């Protein structure tokens, strides 16, 4: 099916507690495979997935140089943005960067991404053309002009259409037994009386991968979006995810409710009901 690779950079200043910390993590779909933390005793790129361990010393050294240099550059960037917003040197701030490539089911590039935020708010983003920028405010425009003068977009594009796609395909092959394996959700419905005239019906989805899933409740065939409590998909810790959807129903009307599950691991959407 479709796949993506993403790197997530977080640079956080902390006046009075040393220089800004830089953390980078890499993912292929919902599987993390690498990490770098400038606060580590001996900062170095480390593997976080079995299939990346086979990469040679050159790979790890290359990664580490990139992250070490980025660590320093983001410290300058944090100083620069503090100034762009006329902020004091007393506060802590964060710059985040999220970038990567999306591939279609045939392995071809669908599109690239390169977005950045400051203190959790969108700051500047590379447009889908991988050639122009969208700045959120007059501060981001300074960065935009600096990046346009340095022809930065061209560098991002070269990477997104080149090495990003090439290495993602390599990872997909080396870790095909997991990365290209969709584990369907194990589903069931639980019943929990709340009072004499109401009961909670909870639809469970466990052990699925990837995280993308659609879990909904229907009453007489009509979606109960407004009356459904849907928790955020959560990691189990074994690579899989979990999720549940619940609805409070009138006692005795349980059979009018159906839970529907959609997941890549499922050839056809599933329909479940409470089974006393």
């Amino acid at each position: 099916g479709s796949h993506s690779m993403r790197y997530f950079y977080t640079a956080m200043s902390r006046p009075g507690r040393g220089e800004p910390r830089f953390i980078a993590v890499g993912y292929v779909d919902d599987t993390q495979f690498v990490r770098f933390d400038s606060d580590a005793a001996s900062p170095r790129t480390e593997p976080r997935a079995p299939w990346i361990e086979q990469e040679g010393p050159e790979y790890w050294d290359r990664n580490t140089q990139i992250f070490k240099t980025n660590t320093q550059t983001y410290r300058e960037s944090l100083r620069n943005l503090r100034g762009y917003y006329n902020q004091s040197e007393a506060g802590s701030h964060i710059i985040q960067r999220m970038y990567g490539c999306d591939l279609g089911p045939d392995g071809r590039l669908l599109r690239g991404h390169d977005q950045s935020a400051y203190d959790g708010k969108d700051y500047i983003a590379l447009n889908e053309d991988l050639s122009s920028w969208t700045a959120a405010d007059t501060a981001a425009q300074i960065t935009q002009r600096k990046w346009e003068a340095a022809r930065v977009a061209e560098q991002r594009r070269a990477y997104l259409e080149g090495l990003c796609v090439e290495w993602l395909r390599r990872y997909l092959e080396n870790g095909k037994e997991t990365l290209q394996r969709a584990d369907p959700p194990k589903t069931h419905v639980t019943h929990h009386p709340v009072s004499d005239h109401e009961a909670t019906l909870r639809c469970w989805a466990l052990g699925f991968y990837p995280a993308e899933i659609t879990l909904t409740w229907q009453r007489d065939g009509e979606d109960q979006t407004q009356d459904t409590e849907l928790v955020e998909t959560r990691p189990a810790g074994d690579r899989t995810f979990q999720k549940w959807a619940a609805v409070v129903v009138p006692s005795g009307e349980e059979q009018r409710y159906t839970c529907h599950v959609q997941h890549e691991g499922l050839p056809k959407p599933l329909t479940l009901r409470w089974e006393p």
Binding site: A24, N63, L81, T143, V152
Partner: peptide
């Protein structure tokens, strides 16, 4: 693989 360093100076924000 993350974005490699450019030939010149990595451009800060």
């Amino acid at each position: 693989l993350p974005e490699p360093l450019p030939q010149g100076q990595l451009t800060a924000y």
